[PDB]
Design a protein around this nucleic acid. Structure first.
Length: 158
DNA sequence: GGATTACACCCAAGACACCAGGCACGAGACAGAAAAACACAACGAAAACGGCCACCACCC
């Protein structure tokens, strides 16, 4: 970030390539690059099913999960979460007023608030609930699969 | 007119003496920096922001 490279053959060529630009610090702060480093400036640079992942988007941010099914297009990956639902207690959400999490129990939703499709698979307000676990189409940008440090609650649960 | 004879001296060999180029070291005043400059108390008053992007949203 903040570093811009221009491939020229003379210093004044770089000067005029960066001249006439207001998005450039007025200083001519330019440094040469070693032969080995030339290719190092253009180097471009772990998502598996059953991989423990966390969410960062919308209301369910910061919730660990399991990647369930990846779409053929390669942009959206299904997740297995522990729902955070209110059972119609205050329906008449964000990432700061959210109550705690708990696996879907069909009995509670039936008693308080529901189209049963298969055994354990419940479609509730556009949400997929398999065996009490939250299923929804999560965009790959919304999820973290690398560098996840499991917490105490995850050891207790996972 | 050259050698030869008779002879004056004097100057180079030999002993012990000297100059200035630069080189190590003082310090030099410049400047340039810092760096601190009363006690106690009372009152009122105002106090971060851009772009971000799911999400609700509207007409299509």
């Amino acid at each position: 970030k903040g570093h811009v490279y221009i491939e020229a053959r003379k210093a004044e060529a770089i000067n005029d390539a960066l001249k006439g630009n207001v998005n450039v610090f007025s200083n001519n702060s330019k440094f040469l690059v070693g032969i080995v480093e030339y290719k190092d400036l253009l180097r471009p640079v772990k998502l598996t099913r059953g991989s423990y992942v966390r969410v960062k988007n919308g209301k369910f941010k910061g919730d660990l999960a399991q990647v369930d099914e990846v779409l053929e297009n390669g942009l959206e990956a299904r997740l297995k979460l522990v729902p955070r639902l209110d059972y119609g207690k205050d329906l008449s959400y964000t990432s700061k007023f959210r109550p705690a999490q708990r696996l879907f129990s069909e009995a509670e939703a039936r008693v308080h608030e529901i189209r049963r499709d298969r055994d354990g698979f419940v479609t509730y307000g556009g949400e997929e609930y398999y065996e009490g676990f939250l299923y929804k189409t999560f965009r790959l940008q919304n999820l973290i699969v690398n560098s996840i440090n499991p917490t105490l609650n995850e050891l207790s649960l996972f």
